[PDB]
Scaffold this active site. Structure first.
Site, PDB file in Angstrom:
ATOM      1  N   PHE A 134      -2.361  12.187  -2.690  1.00 55.47           N
ATOM      2  CA  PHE A 134      -2.029  12.523  -1.354  1.00 55.47           C
ATOM      3  C   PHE A 134      -1.801  11.645  -0.076  1.00 55.47           C
ATOM      4  CE2 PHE A 134      -3.561  15.539   2.631  1.00 55.47           C
ATOM      5  CZ  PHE A 134      -3.299  14.692   3.801  1.00 55.47           C
ATOM      6  N   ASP A 156      -0.108   3.052  -3.158  1.00 56.13           N
ATOM      7  CA  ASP A 156      -0.284   3.124  -1.929  1.00 56.13           C
ATOM      8  C   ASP A 156      -2.236   3.014  -1.272  1.00 56.13           C
ATOM      9  OD1 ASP A 156      -1.263   4.989   0.347  1.00 56.13           O
ATOM     10  OD2 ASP A 156      -0.667   6.578   0.130  1.00 56.13           O
ATOM     11  N   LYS A 211      -4.700   2.460   8.376  1.00 54.93           N
ATOM     12  CA  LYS A 211      -6.077   2.982   8.921  1.00 54.93           C
ATOM     13  C   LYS A 211      -6.903   1.849   9.213  1.00 54.93           C
ATOM     14  CE  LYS A 211      -6.721   7.247   6.090  1.00 54.93           C
ATOM     15  NZ  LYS A 211      -6.213   7.816   6.582  1.00 54.93           N
TER      16      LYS A 211
HETATM   17  C1  LIG Z   1      -4.523   6.666   0.892  1.00 53.67           C
HETATM   18  C2  LIG Z   1      -3.268   7.682   1.769  1.00 53.67           C
HETATM   19  N1  LIG Z   1      -2.219   7.596   2.164  1.00 53.67           N
HETATM   20  C3  LIG Z   1      -1.694   7.823   3.746  1.00 53.67           C
HETATM   21  C4  LIG Z   1      -2.524   8.947   4.095  1.00 53.67           C
HETATM   22  C5  LIG Z   1      -1.353  10.055   5.280  1.00 53.67           C
HETATM   23  O1  LIG Z   1      -1.911   8.735   5.660  1.00 53.67           O
HETATM   24  P1  LIG Z   1      -1.319   9.520   8.558  1.00 53.67           P
HETATM   25  O2  LIG Z   1      -2.032  10.340   8.490  1.00 53.67           O
HETATM   26  O3  LIG Z   1      -2.491   7.813   8.371  1.00 53.67           O
HETATM   27  O4  LIG Z   1      -0.048   9.434   8.418  1.00 53.67           O
HETATM   28  C6  LIG Z   1      -3.411   9.504   3.652  1.00 53.67           C
HETATM   29  C7  LIG Z   1      -4.452  10.160   5.136  1.00 53.67           C
HETATM   30  N2  LIG Z   1      -5.668  10.139   4.233  1.00 53.67           N
HETATM   31  C8  LIG Z   1      -6.181  11.136   5.278  1.00 53.67           C
HETATM   32  C9  LIG Z   1      -5.982  12.284   6.306  1.00 53.67           C
HETATM   33  C10 LIG Z   1      -5.904  13.226   6.528  1.00 53.67           C
HETATM   34  C11 LIG Z   1      -5.725  14.661   7.286  1.00 53.67           C
HETATM   35  O5  LIG Z   1      -6.542  14.699   8.737  1.00 53.67           O
HETATM   36  O6  LIG Z   1      -4.512  14.953   7.556  1.00 53.67           O
HETATM   37  C12 LIG Z   1      -6.507  14.081   5.052  1.00 53.67           C
HETATM   38  C13 LIG Z   1      -7.060  12.252   4.833  1.00 53.67           C
HETATM   39  C14 LIG Z   1      -8.382  12.002   3.245  1.00 53.67           C
HETATM   40  O7  LIG Z   1      -8.041  10.958   2.868  1.00 53.67           O
HETATM   41  C15 LIG Z   1      -4.037   8.084   2.661  1.00 53.67           C
HETATM   42  O8  LIG Z   1      -5.653   8.783   2.312  1.00 53.67           O
END
Ligand SMILES: Cc1[nH+]cc(COP(=O)(O)O)c(C[NH2+][C@H]2C[C@@H](C(=O)[O-])C[C@H]2C=O)c1[O-]
Ligand SMILES: Cc1[nH+]cc(COP(=O)(O)O)c(C[NH2+][C@H]2C[C@@H](C(=O)[O-])CC2C=O)c1[O-]
Lengths: 404, 404
Positions: free
Chosen positions: B142, B228, B257
């Site tokens: 994800f 990532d 984050k």
């Molecule tokens: C390792 C990693 N790499 C890229 C991203 C995307 O980053 P971003 O959302 O900042 O664009 C994330 C986002 N993690 C989120 C966002 C979320 C929602 O609400 O959709 C679900 C949630 C669970 O972990 C991430 O954990």
């Protein structure tokens, strides 16, 4: 921390990526229409961060909104609710007269969200067979630097080298209703995404009646009209939205940049229920989308635009700016175009000058503007600028243009 | 402005998009490890906004950095240079020991940037024929909600309905070195993008030696290893990066984050010159990427992590948390897994309870956590939490789990 301008360049050169070639000027302070560099020199800003600072840099009311909310709460993620979001949603929706808003961060993300909606609605409402849904764009469009965004770009610099492109994106000429009509003959087309004025392409304004035509053709062939107003919206062209100039109501409008006043990355996607609710829980979002801090800045930022009548200011001052620029000699400045305070000029590229050189000399005379293709210089000051200030800037332009 | 919790829900229901189904709790204040709702109730936060608030909500030093810079300058766009960016770039690069960083806003954008680099390097350095370059991902991955991100998703909820998918994305099982070896047989593969621990999938930890294997296979077949670390990085797992647990150096690391501490959307892409410089001026960027305000927060946010030894805290408290969670009955909690303060438990879904119900009851006992699939509850408190506070929360967990 090296304090000098050359040290700022060379430090960014060593430790930072070379994905920009900015105008050599290292800025340290910004307020209203003015920017100051690290040696204390003063510049009018005629870019307004591509319209992100319509309200001028660090507008006090937007600053205070930020300062107030940071002490309370800044991010819960949307795993929970926060107190601010729904307040913002009630304001923005009632302001623009759409059922619902979907909050995102950056401009590209609003675009990506609109395509997802276009497609979802295409499959679920229009009944297009799964994964044949198409989105039409216009040549010269610009809506971000994702793999999808660049897949609909006619600019080689954007897409060349960036690997297989997203299918389902057709491209037609801008400002061309016969082309749109031709394209919408395919029942699998879901949306047409277009800017009322193309910013990044060099402030290209379409003929009067283009937007009415787009609205009429979209409605006729059951295709969604997506107005990208990330740069033209929120007062800059001299209206809430540039589409208002022809009283047209897109199915989906995208807002960004000025939605925050430069204090926070906030974008929004505005549409009615029959489109928006095609996306069920869990199927779309973003960590920072709709956060309490962004929403507070956004409310404040929208309040400034309304209560300082910045659209009305932009419209009137726009006329003055253009009328003055048209008095420059036809041999040097081949075109002047714009609406409100989103204008541009095309310079004849010759052996004694180009747009880059001009912009360098404008900088030396205390005005900051950037060329967008090599002949096109953009003139987009903050909307809080007044008539005398604008007339000082114009004299800076004239002086610089006539010195070559 | 309706002040009550139910009014916050129903107002967001009317005027906001239905792309989330949050845990019914309306938050108004946050500080350190604690969140308060609009009726004044107090909750331990065991989500930390998916790791965005490692430093606790509104950490004073990060707040002050924001408050100081807003009064100065917030956004010039990268048409010009600002005084802050290069300072941030020098710090982050020297901290993680990579030549250069490319600044972006949201996590998805960092991902998109890494793919663009992977591809560009594939064509220009590796000599892959144009638009045959491939990127491998791992099942359960994800990394955002763009059309590209969802094109590499094995989750139906993310991609179903969202129209034709980006080509050149192959997907293999996670924690499976034979699968990776098989895949990297194709000379057109450019990168393999993987998380050291899969967050969104339910805190899935790979076997010891997986990342060493990934590093060794990538190097052997001349393929870029993209880690990532948007969620696992910056102290949460008990190290600067989770990859540090096996002393592995990815080609490209993604940060997000916690890079801001919840106060601003900031992401970063870190790699060396031979990869980074494949992207020439004008070919990639973002309006808010590298802005002065985000960079100031980021410096401050990274300083907190180092000077409060939050990794070392996270590692030790992680052990306690897991050891206690394993004492719960096997009949109710079927699994406990994690590294540092990124842990989870799986609940046996039956007719008397599920993860959602549990999380509702945790809320009623003053703890906030959300399920990520229907059986998996995530336990990720801020890293500034101390041993007694953690032991109060554990008692809240035990109490709630045993009450069914
Ligand atoms: C390792 C990693 N790499 C890229 C991203 C995307 O980053 P971003 O959302 O900042 O664009 C994330 C986002 N993690 C989120 C966002 C979320 C929602 O609400 O959709 C679900 C949630 C669970 O972990 C991430 O954990
Ligand atoms: C109409 C429209 N629709 C979507 C977006 C995406 O906005 P975003 O950058 O927030 O993703 C933009 C942003 N336009 C930019 C970004 C910029 C840079 O420096 O990269 C150069 C530039 C010139 O116009 C936009 O004008």
């Amino acid at each position: 921390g090296p304090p000098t301008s050359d040290d700022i360049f060379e430090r960014e050169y060593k430790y930072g990526a070379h994905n920009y070639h900015p105008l050599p000027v290292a800025l340290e302070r910004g307020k209203g229409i003015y920017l100051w560099d690290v040696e204390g020199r003063k510049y009018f800003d005629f870019l307004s961060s591509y319209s992100a600072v319509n309200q001028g840099h660090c507008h006090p009311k937007i600053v205070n909104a930020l300062k107030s909310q940071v002490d309370k709460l800044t991010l819960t993620s949307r795993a929970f609710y926060n107190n601010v979001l729904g307040e913002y949603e009630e304001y923005i929706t009632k302001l623009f007269n759409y059922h619902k808003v979907l909050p995102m961060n950056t401009g590209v993300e609003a675009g990506e969200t609109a395509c997802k909606l276009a497609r979802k609605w295409g499959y679920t409402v229009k009944g297009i067979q799964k994964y044949k849904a198409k989105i039409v764009f216009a040549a010269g469009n610009f809506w971000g630097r994702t793999l999808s965004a660049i897949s609909s770009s006619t600019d080689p610099t954007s897409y060349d080298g960036f690997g297989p492109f997203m299918p389902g994106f057709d491209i037609i000429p801008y400002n061309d209703l016969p082309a749109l009509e031709r394209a919408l003959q395919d029942p699998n087309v879901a949306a047409f995404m277009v800017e009322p004025i193309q910013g990044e392409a060099g402030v290209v304004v379409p003929d009067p009646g283009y937007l009415m035509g787009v609205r009429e053709l979209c409605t006729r062939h059951q295709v969604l009209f997506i107005a990208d107003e990330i740069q033209t919206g929120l007062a800059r062209t001299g209206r809430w939205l540039a589409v208002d100039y022809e009283n047209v109501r897109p199915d989906i409008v995208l807002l960004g940049k000025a939605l925050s006043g430069g204090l926070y990355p906030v974008s929004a996607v505005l549409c009615d229920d029959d489109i928006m609710l095609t996306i069920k829980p869990g199927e779309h979002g973003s960590t920072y989308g709709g956060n309490p801090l962004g929403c507070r800045v956004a409310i404040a930022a929208l309040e400034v635009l309304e209560e300082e009548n910045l659209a009305e200011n932009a419209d009137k001052l726009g006329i003055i700016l253009r009328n003055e620029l048209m008095k420059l000699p036809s041999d040097v400045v081949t075109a002047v175009r714009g609406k409100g305070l989103l204008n541009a000029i095309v310079i004849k590229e010759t052996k004694d000058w180009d747009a880059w050189k001009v912009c360098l000399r404008l900088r030396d005379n205390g005005l900051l503007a950037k060329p967008t293709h090599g002949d096109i210089i953009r003139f987009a000051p903050p909307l809080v600028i007044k008539e005398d200030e604008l007339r000082e800037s114009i004299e800076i332009i004239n002086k610089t243009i006539l010195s070559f």
